[PDB]
Amino acid sequence: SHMTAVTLDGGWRVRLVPGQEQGKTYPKAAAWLPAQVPGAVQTDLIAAKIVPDPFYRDNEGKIQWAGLSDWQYQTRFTVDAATLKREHVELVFDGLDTFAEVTLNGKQLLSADNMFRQWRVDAKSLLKRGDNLLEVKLYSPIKKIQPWLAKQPYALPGAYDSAFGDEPEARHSSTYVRKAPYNFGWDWGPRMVNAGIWKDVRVEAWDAVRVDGLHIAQQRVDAHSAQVQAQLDLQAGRSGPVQVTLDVLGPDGQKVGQFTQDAVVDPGQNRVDLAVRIANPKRWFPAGYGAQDRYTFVASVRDADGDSQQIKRVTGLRSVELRREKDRFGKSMEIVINGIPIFAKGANLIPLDAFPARVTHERMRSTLQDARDANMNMLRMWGGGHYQDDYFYDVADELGIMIWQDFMFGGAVPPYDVEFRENTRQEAIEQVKRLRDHPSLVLWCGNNEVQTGWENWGDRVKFKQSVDPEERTRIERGMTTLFGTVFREVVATYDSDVPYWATSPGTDFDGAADQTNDGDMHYWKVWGGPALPVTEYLNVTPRFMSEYGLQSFPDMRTVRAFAEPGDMDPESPVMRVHQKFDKGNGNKRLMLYIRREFGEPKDFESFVYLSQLMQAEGINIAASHLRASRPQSMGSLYWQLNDVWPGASWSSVDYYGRWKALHYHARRFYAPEMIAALRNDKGQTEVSLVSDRTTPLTARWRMRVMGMDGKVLSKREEKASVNALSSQHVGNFSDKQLLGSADPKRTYAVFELLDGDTLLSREVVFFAPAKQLALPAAKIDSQWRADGDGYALTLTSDTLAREVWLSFGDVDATLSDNAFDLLPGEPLTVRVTSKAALAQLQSALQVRDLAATLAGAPPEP
Amino acid sequence: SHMTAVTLDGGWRVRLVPGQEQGKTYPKAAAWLPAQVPGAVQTDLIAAKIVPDPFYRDNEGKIQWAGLSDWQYQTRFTVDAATLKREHVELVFDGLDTFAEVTLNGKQLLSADNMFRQWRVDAKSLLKRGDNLLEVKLYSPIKKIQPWLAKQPYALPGAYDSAFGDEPEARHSSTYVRKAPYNFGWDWGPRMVNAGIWKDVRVEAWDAVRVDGLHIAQQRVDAHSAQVQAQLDLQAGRSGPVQVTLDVLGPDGQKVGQFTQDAVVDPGQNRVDLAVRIANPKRWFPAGYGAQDRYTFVASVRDADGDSQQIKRVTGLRSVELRREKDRFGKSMEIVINGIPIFAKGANLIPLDAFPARVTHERMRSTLQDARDANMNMLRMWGGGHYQDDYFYDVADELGIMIWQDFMFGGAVPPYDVEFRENTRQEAIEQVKRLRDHPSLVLWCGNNEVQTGWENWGDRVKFKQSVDPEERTRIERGMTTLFGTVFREVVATYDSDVPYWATSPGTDFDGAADQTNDGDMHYWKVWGGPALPVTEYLNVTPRFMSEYGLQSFPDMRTVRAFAEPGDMDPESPVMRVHQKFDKGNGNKRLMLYIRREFGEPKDFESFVYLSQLMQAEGINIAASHLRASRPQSMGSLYWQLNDVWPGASWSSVDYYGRWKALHYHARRFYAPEMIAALRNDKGQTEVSLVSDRTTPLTARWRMRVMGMDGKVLSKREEKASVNALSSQHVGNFSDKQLLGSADPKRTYAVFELLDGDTLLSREVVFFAPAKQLALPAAKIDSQWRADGDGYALTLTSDTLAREVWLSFGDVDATLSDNAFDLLPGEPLTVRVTSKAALAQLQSALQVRDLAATLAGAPPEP
Numbered sequence A, B: 001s002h003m004t005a006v007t008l009d010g011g012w013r014v015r016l017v018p019g020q021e022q023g024k025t026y027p028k029a030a031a032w033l034p035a036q037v038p039g040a041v042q043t044d045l046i047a048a049k050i051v052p053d054p055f056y057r058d059n060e061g062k063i064q065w066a067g068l069s070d071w072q073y074q075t076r077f078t079v080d081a082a083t084l085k086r087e088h089v090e091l092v093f094d095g096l097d098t099f100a101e102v103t104l105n106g107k108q109l110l111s112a113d114n115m116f117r118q119w120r121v122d123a124k125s126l127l128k129r130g131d132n133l134l135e136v137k138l139y140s141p142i143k144k145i146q147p148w149l150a151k152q153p154y155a156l157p158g159a160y161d162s163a164f165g166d167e168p169e170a171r172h173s174s175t176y177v178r179k180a181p182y183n184f185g186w187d188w189g190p191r192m193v194n195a196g197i198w199k200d201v202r203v204e205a206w207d208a209v210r211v212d213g214l215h216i217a218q219q220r221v222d223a224h225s226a227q228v229q230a231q232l233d234l235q236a237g238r239s240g241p242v243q244v245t246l247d248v249l250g251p252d253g254q255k256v257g258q259f260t261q262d263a264v265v266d267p268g269q270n271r272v273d274l275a276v277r278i279a280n281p282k283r284w285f286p287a288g289y290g291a292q293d294r295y296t297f298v299a300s301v302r303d304a305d306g307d308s309q310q311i312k313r314v315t316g317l318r319s320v321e322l323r324r325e326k327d328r329f330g331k332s333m334e335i336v337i338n339g340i341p342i343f344a345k346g347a348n349l350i351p352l353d354a355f356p357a358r359v360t361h362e363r364m365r366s367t368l369q370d371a372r373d374a375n376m377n378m379l380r381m382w383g384g385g386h387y388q389d390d391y392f393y394d395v396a397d398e399l400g401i402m403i404w405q406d407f408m409f410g411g412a413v414p415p416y417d418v419e420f421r422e423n424t425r426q427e428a429i430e431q432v433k434r435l436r437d438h439p440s441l442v443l444w445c446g447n448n449e450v451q452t453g454w455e456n457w458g459d460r461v462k463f464k465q466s467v468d469p470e471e472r473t474r475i476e477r478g479m480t481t482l483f484g485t486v487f488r489e490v491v492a493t494y495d496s497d498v499p500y501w502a503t504s505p506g507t508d509f510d511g512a513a514d515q516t517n518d519g520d521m522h523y524w525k526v527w528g529g530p531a532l533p534v535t536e537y538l539n540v541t542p543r544f545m546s547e548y549g550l551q552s553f554p555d556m557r558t559v560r561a562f563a564e565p566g567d568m569d570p571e572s573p574v575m576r577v578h579q580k581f582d583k584g585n586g587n588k589r590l591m592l593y594i595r596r597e598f599g600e601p602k603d604f605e606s607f608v609y610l611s612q613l614m615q616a617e618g619i620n621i622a623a624s625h626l627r628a629s630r631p632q633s634m635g636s637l638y639w640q641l642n643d644v645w646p647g648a649s650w651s652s653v654d655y656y657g658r659w660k661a662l663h664y665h666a667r668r669f670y671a672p673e674m675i676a677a678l679r680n681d682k683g684q685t686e687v688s689l690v691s692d693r694t695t696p697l698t699a700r701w702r703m704r705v706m707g708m709d710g711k712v713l714s715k716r717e718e719k720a721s722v723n724a725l726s727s728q729h730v731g732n733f734s735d736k737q738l739l740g741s742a743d744p745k746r747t748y749a750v751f752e753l754l755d756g757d758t759l760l761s762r763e764v765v766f767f768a769p770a771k772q773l774a775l776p777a778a779k780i781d782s783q784w785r786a787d788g789d790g791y792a793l794t795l796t797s798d799t800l801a802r803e804v805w806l807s808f809g810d811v812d813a814t815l816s817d818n819a820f821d822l823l824p825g826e827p828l829t830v831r832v833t834s835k836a837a838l839a840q841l842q843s844a845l846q847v848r849d850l851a852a853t854l855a856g857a858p859p860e861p
């Protein structure tokens, strides 16, 4: 009979395992309370109003006890006679976080110890007709591991200390458990050591054959043909004939062809492979390089009892090559898609929430749409988080956002015992199997920063030199095996047509990590470490930059969402709670960078804005430099894209999906055709024309040197033929070739790139820190007009207006552009999209600019 | 038209590359001399009488200059107009040893740097009609590498020093080149740093499609069914239709089924898979566990231009599992074939000649037949040699000799550069692809002794502690990547159904190497190191013993083959050359073990015989112990099986295929049903019954304690039901439960295992070293009788006669048994096979026994 699958998302309740100190302290949690599946006991507590929202003000501490406690889930469910007559009946847990003991009708069913693994167990023996009682006990990873850890000769160098002191310093349990690293707190997120059934639970029943998977293995793909192999993986309880039918539909939906294969399956696993050749394929390309065409593979399996079953895969035909060849700059690192070398433009992706089980499809999609809108073509799913929901990868496929997929290791030195290795191997197999058919997934990576940490971080270096050399060898061997062998083999076996990368940053264990002439780099000498000036970005040029960034505050709307009017000061206890860099004392670093460029902010609202400008302009410099240095560099992924929480971070989009100034800048410096004018610390401005086109660009570029009084000092226009997929230097100007005798504090330069009379890109360059400039007081005129859905807002400034920031108080609105420069007498129109009426928008409109913000600023302390 | 292939095995000639010092010194080599291909310039020189046979007496040194020289090969070959019309014309080199520069008609063709790789190159442009000149220059690996090595901060720990001083001590070039390690000399072989085109060269021409391989991929195999996939690999120059037919024949030649697959191929590589399911397969079993049944898969390809091509594979269906499970003794290591745990019985296989290109098919077959006849089921092809000829593996398949296949790394610490790694990777891919379809190949192993050397050998320990810790990490990472990742992936990708083993001995990088409770072991505390007594074998019991051994001299006939009557003294200049252990003082180690048991040999012939008895009895102890210890141990592979040259070694069969006493003993202690009676150094004799049967054994076993005067002291017989695949201890007897009051120097014990009225196995036990025994003067009678081809020779001794050795001077004859014990009045018949006449065999017959040999012995020094 038809394979049946019933989800158990009803009647769940949860309570503290009896006998714990937390039970006495929180008696409401000692009693049964409603529970959501999927969910977390933390959010169950919040929903039952037992604890306040941990995101709000300084409530974070008030929920910490939950992650130190043991929890007991319970649900009852009924199984009908047809289901119990079936030859196979199983319970499936897609996600247990993390140390779980499951009982069914009072006897043992399952032991689970990996947040990222699927657990299938034969339940038929233990099930009864009518009412069944399913219980799931979850144990605090901290409470379970710490007693063991305290007796060990050493604790492995881990991640972050507990700000609440419930784990010893430098003795982190997080290292020893397969659980999302960021749960234990990070320098942009709260400590939420979640416990929960955080994925679906199912009762599944089948008779002759269970279809366990379909994988469209791409053997070779080019313009002329695609040769693939549909691989059906079939679990059979008894030997017998099956017949497989395969329909292939193209991007439009028409049948591409039909294929059939008879086979005899035997008890256990069986693979039935069907070869498919697609002439002149409509291939899948990343964003900006074509369409995101996808084919649909539909397999039908009829078993020995005449029962038919369907399984579908929506996949994209594409070749992927990680090209590493020797050249002038050492050894390249290029993502090549369909024979096209793609300069990776994007950012690092972290979880969308501190509580991942409640993340909506809406937010998953808008996060990717954000990336697409800022002209990105790649996101790196950073290894300190969790593997995303299926739907996330679906939208990624659809939008053409390539995914650099870390396995979920975030920097901690892993233990080298076999059991941890084999536990992790099975995790890798299941995730690779689940995600491999997504065309957007173009690279697997073993971890984030483990090697570079081992080699470059003070604590790692001291540790590895403190232990006996033979113990050091055991530890290093464990890492090399896990990240060099185990993960590589899983990918080579199950997702063979995409490359693997031992560690980010690194050279795939060829040599040392974080090199400038081989592999990728995480550059944090700006912001972190010595905290060098942002112009130092111009002196660093790796073959691929996979991390770098600057911090900023979220939107004013987001600030008011977690803070009250009395809290509006970066040094307030509430703002410090929401600043997680450098043990809560992050503002000092943030203020270092703000003051450098803009001096001392007049008020809290100016502080937030200036913090965002600091971040935006700093990253603008680096990204433009990287792109302009092609083919020396071939990748820019800034830290970070998104937030898990309302608070200060390196994101360009905050927790509520609100664009910072950086994200608006990102669209520009990631634009397919871009002009880069970068003035370094020697007073030299290098101008480059960047084109990601696969065709030549017949361009013109202008250069105008302006007094801040409106007078033009010089005007220049030149022709340029930019090659496809390239960067061309068109000029290099000293300060004195530009200003001559003119005062650098009172002069600026405008750079424009054109195609015919269409302005493709523009950059405004200054010759002194903004705080020293004599910026003009701008009179900005604004006109409104309905335009389709929302409104067209036209801004016109009489003078130069730097970094114009539009906002509307608590009236929600999106803009097609923001944080832009207005040039004298040149009107700019931006699309306002809002549920609000025009009159409301007009009344609520606020127009901020750099000159007005700096005006009246107090001195630096 | 049909693919054509012309082998270039004719007109080859070779000479010193002009401009070398050797050209002046060896002018005969400066001028052209005939060259055989395949071959080596060394054997070319010998054939041209430029140097004498290096195997004979002490001539080894006279050919050393060849390995320090550069050589120029040349051959002419004709190409007709028809071959030049072809769409593709390529030259293929199956074996270049090693650093090769190839030119064709004076133009650059190929650079090669790996003895074990196949080189295919597009030659069509460079060819002309009529005579073509192919030139191959080969460069001495020593001459090429040493100048570079001399400038490096360190030399990697390698292999053996040069006895001729043409490489600095502990600075070996051999580590840095992919070349058979034993070529550079070993402790059982001469230094023959061969240069040569040592495998075939072909000109191949084809049009539409070239068949590049056929692989019968075994997906799952059991009693009920075998599911396989014939994988046809096709290189195409242009897109077009192909047609594939597959015929499958069962073990006698029956049609089991026929299959077809049409496809369109595209430029480059193409995969055509045909699924095949064989109901109730006749599976391949190793020797002693069933038949060696094989199926023949015959594939035919017809392309788009009407060209038909055929490829055949002879393969055996078998499941293979390396089972490692936790038990009382740690973690097991057992080879499981078709669900049957096989106790591995065998030895380590090394190259069959110092010049591998001249090895005959006959010698390949007799070596494996040697193994089969001595009741072995596995040979380990040791990593210091070379991957064998195809024919060797065919015979292995046929005879049921499992092959433990080392990759050809012999112990040296490899360099960690990418270039060496990728060169080695392609080597691994080609060798695995070449050998994977042989059912006898049941395990791949990364190397011999690299890890255990690094951890336990004094020089390695000092070296690794001598470099900066970061440099140590680089070297270790290179090893772990090469042996843990690269080889593993190659095996997992191309030969998925057989296990991989990082290093021998080791725990597959799970932990340290050479453990007693995990993985396999090379035990050399006996013979090597402290040179402990052979009874220490009874105190060492690893989960798998993959190396152990004792040295001995070859047959007297073989000795006379390399030495003259004046050379017959272990300390003579010739015999020292032929002793390669411990540089020049190997004789001291050998005499230590001989003197321990037998005192001082009276003459050279007694020395050879006693050296062989020492070896045979010593290995008997260990091998019997290991088998009797099941399931603690599950493997016995003694070092070594064979020789590369006439001389002293740890072999049981010498260079001319002549059995030592050890091989005759091997047949007995590897027998499927065996009785082990082992007396330890504490005066305790443990008796065990060993059965490799897959069915119960209803046995009786006897024990008799005898005076050397012939009187019986006691007689005992017991019933026993021995379980399948097991060992059963049936007794443990003190010296005093056996002898009571009797003098241990004048009494012995006989242990026998019977099934019904058939004697399966016997062991004779003594209670004191042989030199201290009062063995009786044996009068041994001999009777001859014709039977078909050879003769039946019946031996009858009036008293106990120990270790009787039959020989016939220089008259060649083989024996069905030798080196046996004769019991008083009990006749033994051995079959003599010889071309000789009866009268001459009778005249030439020499019969030696232990007592007569010890009689007249001089005192020890």
Ligand SMILES: OC[C@H]1O[C@@H](O)[C@@H](O)[C@@H](O)[C@@H]1O
Residues within 6 Å of the ligand: A186, A187, A188, A448, A449, A524, A528, A547, A639
């Ligand atoms: O190592 C410093 C940076 O490294 C990244 O991988 C992230 O962990 C960031 O949150 C962090 O600021």
Ligand SMILES: OC[C@H]1O[C@@H](O)[C@@H](O)[C@@H](O)[C@@H]1O
Residues within 6 Å of the ligand: B144, B145, B148, B176, B419
């Ligand atoms: O090949 C890598 C390098 O190391 C050794 O092999 C030497 O032969 C060098 O000539 C070579 O350049």
Ligand SMILES: OC[C@H]1O[C@@H](O)[C@@H](O)[C@@H](O)[C@@H]1O
Residues within 6 Å of the ligand: B186, B187, B188, B448, B449, B524, B528, B547, B639
């Ligand atoms: O190292 C001692 C032994 O190790 C083995 O691997 C072989 O190389 C033997 O020739 C040698 O006697």
